[PDB]
């Protein structure tokens, strides 16, 4: 060969009380089990930690394995989770046409992600997969990439009904995002704790709900019909939201809790202001290049977003086409 390489491939349920240490050029493949419970530290180098229903080493053309379609991961009482490599969690049983009985609960005191953290969850067309997924370290520091994808039992993106609720943060936690979040497929990302830093969040067909009172430094990009929704009272900061428009890739939207009273858009500043009947005004930076006459506003029950909250919804009837702002 020439270089070092370690592969640990470990089948079945695991109750892990020792530290999880993955070296550089090393892969630790926990697979097959229905119950995973970790309670000590994680030190992931420039290698891969994989926890999933199918082995990391299985492929598109692999025969099914006789494991239950059930996947429960708990990380709790862990003091430190440090990821410098790839950390993948996947609940999908290949070629199963039932939803996994699945829960993911990630509650380490500290989670520092310097590499890639990816969660892959199954959706099934015609079914309604709604697994439990809570990512709420007391302290979450993302210097790398946090991907959440909902895929079919063969690995294509799932875009159907049953938006999977993914709780990110909690009322006491602190999240700093300094690089990238990307949520792909039928995901309702519930941002339930404070987020600060300087980062991008890509919503590829997904919905993100800003439910907390601190959401700063985060630029949001709406792709393939993704939507930004805010349920908390207006933020002091003007959130940047790119991609509002209508194309054949979908209709993206921006929505604020309540019922619409009015809106104003300044084509020389890029700021749109949405005012609700209760008198709350939400300000967002959507870019210059929009024609005020082509905005559309509606009230929604929430059902279009698989929410129970009423929303005042802003859309735009032509494609996203940003321009540089000019006062003129
Ligand atoms: Cl749910
Ligand atoms: Na409602």
Residue numbers in the entry: 17 to 344
Show passages lifted from the paper.
Though it lacks typical virulence factors such as hyphal development, C. glabrata contains a remarkably large and diverse set of putative wall adhesins that is crucial for its success as pathogen. C. glabrata wall adhesins are large, modular glycosylphosphatidylinositol (GPI)-modified proteins. The N-terminal region of mature GPI cell wall proteins (GPI-CWPs)–also referred to as A-region–is believed to define the ligand-binding function. The A-regions of Awp1 and Awp3b consist of 34 and 33 β-strands, respectively, which form a two-domain architecture with a parallel right-handed β-helix at its N-terminus (Awp1: S18-V240 with strands β0-β26, Awp3b: D20-I254 with β1-β26) that is followed by a β-sandwich domain with α-crystallin fold (Awp1: V241-Q314, Awp3b: V255-E334; both with strands β27- β33).
Crystals of the Awp3b A-region (Awp3b-A) belong to rhombohedral space group R32 with one molecule per asymmetric unit. Awp3b A-region crystals soaked with Gd(OAc)3 diffracted to a resolution of 2 Å, therefrom derived SAD phases were used to solve a native dataset of 1.55 Å resolution. Only few regions with uninterpretable electron density are contained in the Awp3b-A•Gd3+-complex, namely the loops consisting of residues S75–D82 and S320–E322. Interestingly, the T1-loops of β-helix turns 4–6 from Awp3b-A are cross-linked by two disulfide bridges, C115-C145 and C144-C178.
